[PDB]
Design a binder for this molecule. Structure first.
Ligand SMILES: CCCCCCCCCCCCCCCCCC(=O)O[C@H](COC(=O)CCCCCCCCCCCCCCC)COP(=O)(O)OCCN
Ligand SMILES: CCCCCCCCCCCCCCCCCC(=O)O[C@H](COC(=O)CCCCCCCCCCCCCCC)COP(=O)(O)OCCN
Ligand code: NA
Lengths: 270, 270
């Protein structure tokens, strides 16, 4: 939309805008197996309050400008995406008008990576705006890290190194159950830096059945309570409501998590 | 001084004071080989400007009162102590008068742990108020971690866990040379979370020849740079002029430091 294009050009690229590039929130990297240019959006790298929306969306416009006249694909990294990264209602709706019609058409495929519970609720709450994304063949959720290789060569992939690191050396606990108004089978994976709870059964997101992956850095873990011989709880910072899980070896799970919370506290800024 | 005993009792400890115990800057722990109650002061734990000095002194005064009538010893952990942990002149002086005479005399010995370059400079800078400490034999510097056992049995030692963490799994580079106007024989030790530059030769601190242990967390390392095959740069956050080191294995050192810096970056907040 050149009307927004020029409104953003009456004052040329400032020095805050140029900072967006260095933080690698949206960038082009690699080519897909289909022979299309790939772009990456690292959701967790956007802070609602800290980052000016108009600059971001404009930074994306300049990035896609040269490419979006032809086929191209987007990889959306939803790793550890939470409230602090959300696009507020009014800002979210901008994305549907600021780009040319063909730019939207030329998107060959969108690859959703590490979709989580919060994002699901987000799409739930913004079900209106995202109806065009509902049951779309272009929308492709990555069940597990290994399936992305089906669309993009492993070497052509360029996810944030921090994202890939979350897939290394995990103590995995299968057959766990997440207790709530609605029970759900999950796997509880403990890493040196965080804890990941992956749904063992598919769930609905934007019309598709997918696997969610909730990530909690050790820094977010406040309270760790062992309730029973097969039940424990986690208190996540700024989340309020405690998470409850059931597992045969809750004693081993808690110890494992306490350890990573400790190793973290040790190496911290005094 | 019972004026501080009075002035502090007329208002008391309602709020913030109770938080001084939660961060444990000064605490009693263990018993020395001499047969005395040991107390610890974690210098890094105190943040000048954030914590009220009078409240701190009041804390220390209370956790000492039950004991300072009899002989006791103090272990001051100067690990990673810097400017943001300093005692302002007017606050420093308050320490020499607020306590009862006998309370001072009853300090059997003070064990200084991990004294660094900055503290030494702070000492030289505040020489006027620290003149009584110059030459004092009650001041016992700890050459190396093991030497502490000469005064406190291992099972009694209660140094902060974070301190002990810096002692294990270290890749050491001996016979290195720190390049300045005055060149200093130093050993460079790379831990999983920090780099330690330990002086191989002694310098003067409060009138005593001792070794220094400069500690730089992975989070403080902004710029590593290999100059020669045997010389490299080490830029620390908020210290300006970078450190310079000579060593036959500089390539190996730089590669090791870059590693722990990269690993740290892969674990940082969004
Ligand atoms: C806010 C929380 C965190 C971010 C994610 C929020 C959404 C939930 C998770 C799923 C994200 C899927 C977004 C995919 C966008 C790229 C391609 C696409 O799906 O198609 C078009 C979008 O193509 C674009 O140009 C998007 C450019 C990417 C920049 C930023 C990436 C993610 C930002 C959040 C959602 C934006 C979706 C686009 C809205 C038009 C939309 O056209 P339409 O179906 O609505 O038909 C009529 C159009 N008026
Ligand atoms: C007496 C003052 C104690 C605090 C000194 C702070 C300045 C930092 C110096 C650099 C490292 C060495 C630590 C100092 C050891 C303290 C022991 C000492 O010498 O005092 C004796 C006994 O000290 C105590 O009983 C103090 C009890 C609590 C100690 C907690 C304070 C430790 C501060 C360490 C970090 C400060 C600065 C960090 C960064 C700038 C009594 O001798 P005096 O008769 O000369 O004193 C009064 C004369 N009328
Ligand atoms: Na004794």
């Amino acid at each position: 939309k050149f009307e927004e294009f020029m409104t953003r050009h009456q004052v040329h690229e400032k020095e805050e805008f140029k900072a967006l590039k260095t933080l690698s929130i949206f960038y082009q990297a690699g080519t897909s197996k289909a022979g299309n240019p790939v772009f990456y959006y690292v959701a967790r790298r956007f802070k609602t309050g800290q980052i000016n929306g108009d600059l971001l969306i404009y930074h994306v416009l300049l990035t896609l400008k040269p490419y979006y006249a032809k086929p191209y694909e987007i990889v959306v990294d939803l790793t550890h995406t939470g409230p602090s990264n959300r696009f507020k209602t009014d800002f979210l709706s901008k994305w549907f008008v600021v780009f040319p019609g063909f730019a939207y058409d030329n998107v060959s495929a969108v690859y959703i990576y590490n979709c989580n519970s919060w994002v699901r609720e987000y799409t739930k709450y913004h079900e209106r705006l995202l109806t065009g994304l509902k049951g779309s063949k272009r929308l492709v959720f990555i069940d597990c890290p290994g399936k992305l290789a089906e669309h993009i060569e492993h070497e052509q992939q360029k996810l944030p190194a921090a994202t890939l690191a979350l897939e290394e050396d995990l103590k995995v606990f299968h057959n766990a159950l997440k207790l709530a108004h609605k029970d759900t089978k999950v796997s509880i994976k403990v890493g040196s830096t965080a804890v990941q709870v992956t749904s063992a059964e598919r769930t609905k997101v934007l019309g598709q059945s997918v696997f969610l992956n909730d990530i909690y850095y050790a820094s977010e873990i406040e309270e760790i309570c062992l309730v029973d011989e097969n039940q424990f709880t986690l208190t996540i910072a700024n989340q309020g409501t405690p998470l409850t899980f059931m597992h045969q070896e809750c004693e081993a799970i808690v110890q494992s998590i306490i350890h990573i919370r400790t190793r973290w506290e040790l190496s911290q800024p005094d």
